[PDB]
Amino acid sequence: SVFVKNVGWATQLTSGAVWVQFNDGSQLVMQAGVSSISYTSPDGQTTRYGENEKLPEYIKQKLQLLSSILLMFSN
Amino acid sequence: SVFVKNVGWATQLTSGAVWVQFNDGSQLVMQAGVSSISYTSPDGQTTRYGENEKLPEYIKQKLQLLSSILLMFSN
């Protein structure tokens, strides 16, 4: 049967790339992006930002807390 | 001082949503999608697909193995 063997990703602020290697030796490399961000402030107010809207700095700084690189392999 | 407290996502075939809760109580809900796929066969041949192209069934089948729902909370 076919199953995932190794997976990895590298993300930035609103986009990222994912890699996957299957047991048959094949591989997929994909690039992805955020189309909308709905931010709910601690005060309960919600604001939506479309892909073509500039993001205020405080949202960018929180997005940066999410940026990461991950590599996982079956052992 | 600001940090990620809880994070989660739900992905389907080529799309997904990510949720994040910070320690200050604010929340981000982001809609995302794969915009390009690069498949490398076991023999090393690469075929690329863009947003305006349809994916073959054997590629989709492999995409389905990636679909997940993840919830992570600080304990």
* Number of other residues whose CB lies within 10 A of the CB of residue B34: 23
The helix/strand/coil state of B16 is strand
**Residue boundaries of the structural domains of chain B:** 1-75
Resolution in A: 2.0
Alpha carbon of residue B23 to chain centroid: 24
Determination approach: X-ray
Q: Which of B2, B26, B38 sits opposite A39 (nearest CB)?
A: B26
Contact predicate A40/A59, CB 8 Å? no
Under an 8 A CB cutoff, do A40 and B59 touch? no
Inter-chain contacts counted by CB atoms under 8 A, chains A and B: 86
Token pair in block for residue B18: 């990510």
Q: Which CATH number fits domain B1-75: 3.90.220.20, 3.40.1390.20, 2.40.50.930, 2.30.42.10?
A: 2.40.50.930
Nearest-angstrom CA–CA distance, B18 and A15:
12
In chain B, whose CA is at the least distance from the CA of A59? B28
Collapsed DSSP state (helix, strand, coil) of residue A37? strand
